Structure 1
């Protein structure tokens, strides 16, 4: 079972090459493309990577100043190291801030997909768009849509997967990151109507189905079961489900963090019930895990031992 984590939005983060050297980590999601074309200057998507990148943004063939970052030099340098180390690197779409971003048509969702594929996918001839990370090719795209409904996303997923299928030699990945409440307002249409390789339900910040509601069953009702049942119905039936967790008490709202012993008792129960769908743990996020050093190692290292034990 696999350990996925988020990097990109950590206060004072170290550079991604620190995390590339963390052997426990099998997947790293880079957040975020957070400005969508429909409300962003030029219809270009924009990006934000916390402290990373020199602050420069592309301007278009029209002189339009965009929201995309053009000098992300450490990330370009660092994504190949991660991949040279066995790790899959997915570029994440959305995130928490700002909360006023969405997709308005099926056309803009095909264009959004196509722009990301040209931009961060394989190097391609006729592509006359940006290459924010140079000749690096990501392994996939993560959908962390946490605002404004689910319109457009199954289309973006199938459009992506349409593109994947032309590169038969290489294997590319689609994941999503719902919150616990079923149905997820952002991603249930996506999950149902398209094939996600991985899905990591965020089990923090919502009381009625939080991971901590497994340890304290008075807080809400941990619902991984209901989720295996919808997954079975869906176009993502072969998706691997992940229990999404905060890597430190200071990573999500108070009381969502579980101690390793609490995690283990979650994991050994749901790895055994659904050995065929259970996939692993996902952490929010990389920096909080760094700073949560338990006996000379970070939180993620202790998660991986749990999964192997």
Structure 2
């Protein structure tokens, strides 16, 4: 079967992560966001935000400098294991919408960024004397939701993560990317060409030229999933599965990009049929919008899984 991914962490008044860990239909949950990068953040540690989650406390560096990395995410720490017990993959997402001034400035800081995240969030290692924001929890991988400021250093980060993954062959870890629909994508086409992602979720909303809506109304633009299949072929991500990223309600993205379940089926059955090896499934922005959009007594994400399984 194909997979259903969804982001969580940035939903206004979102329910805690375990609620979605309890939702059968979800296969992958991207937790957003590591939103502050080491080159420009306080203390030069990565920083995090998970909306209404965590108690507000932050770590400080060895020299007393206040960071933006949250240290009291009790609920998330408790909930991730529930997701993984139910068979789900939990990916920690890097970037997100806010703030808009974060980037990577050198290959060195790229390596060091991924090293830091691997130590903080990957396997517990005796040689690590740094922060463990989710304690003994080990995430299943990293998602690159780079929304601003170009594509420097993300390839190096992915390559560094892979190297670290390969030193733990008894466990599988995953790398993913969320480019927008226009090729080249200013943030992620470089990483996609130069480094290997397992999953790539194209955000099929907010860009008129190629949106999922233009599949339904072809006067709007041209849905370009075919082009994304072609562009993988020269890339180091040539074996990536491609997912159709969609808004989970009317108000989750810009006006006019939401599709009804029936509209999604028409798109998905066409493309699932056309690319049975490359089509990975659906990505949803995002969990709260899905949960609040109840259709026939079930949230949007459940109807998305129906379409993928039917």
CA deviation after TM superposition for structure 1 residue 128, in Å: 1.2
Equivalent in the alignment of 2:64: 63
- Taking the TM superposition and a 5 Å limit, the aligned residue runs for 1:132-281 are 132-281=133-282
Equivalent in the alignment of 2:307: 306
Q: Distance in 1 between matches of 2:41 and 2:57?
A: 16
- Taking the TM superposition and a 5 Å limit, the aligned residue runs for 1:125-136 are 125-136=126-137
CA deviation after TM superposition for structure 1 residue 125, in Å: 1.1
Summarize deviations over 1:50-78 as a string: whole Å, max 9, x none.
Answer: 00000011011100000000000000000
Equivalent in the alignment of 2:46: 45
Q: Which runs of 5+ in 1 are unaligned?
A: none
Summarize deviations over 1:106-161 as a string: whole Å, max 9, x none.
Answer: 00000000000000000001111100000000000000001000000000000000
Q: Distance in 2 between matches of 1:15 and 1:158?
A: 32
Q: Which runs of 5+ in 2 are unaligned?
A: none
Equivalent in the alignment of 1:78: 79
Q: Distance in 2 between matches of 1:161 and 1:243?
A: 24
TM-score between the two structures when normalised by the length of structure 2: 0.99
CA deviation after TM superposition for structure 1 residue 12, in Å: 0.1
SS at match of 2:115: helix
Q: Distance in 2 between matches of 1:252 and 1:225?
A: 23
CA deviation after TM superposition for structure 1 residue 220, in Å: 1.1
CA deviation after TM superposition for structure 1 residue 255, in Å: 0.4
SS at match of 2:29: strand
SS at match of 1:93: strand
Q: Distance in 2 between matches of 1:113 and 1:275?
A: 33
CA deviation after TM superposition for structure 1 residue 42, in Å: 1.6
CA deviation after TM superposition for structure 1 residue 273, in Å: 0.6
Provide the aligned C-alpha RMSD in A: 0.4
Equivalent in the alignment of 1:283: 284
CA deviation after TM superposition for structure 1 residue 183, in Å: 0.2
Moved over 6 A (4+): none
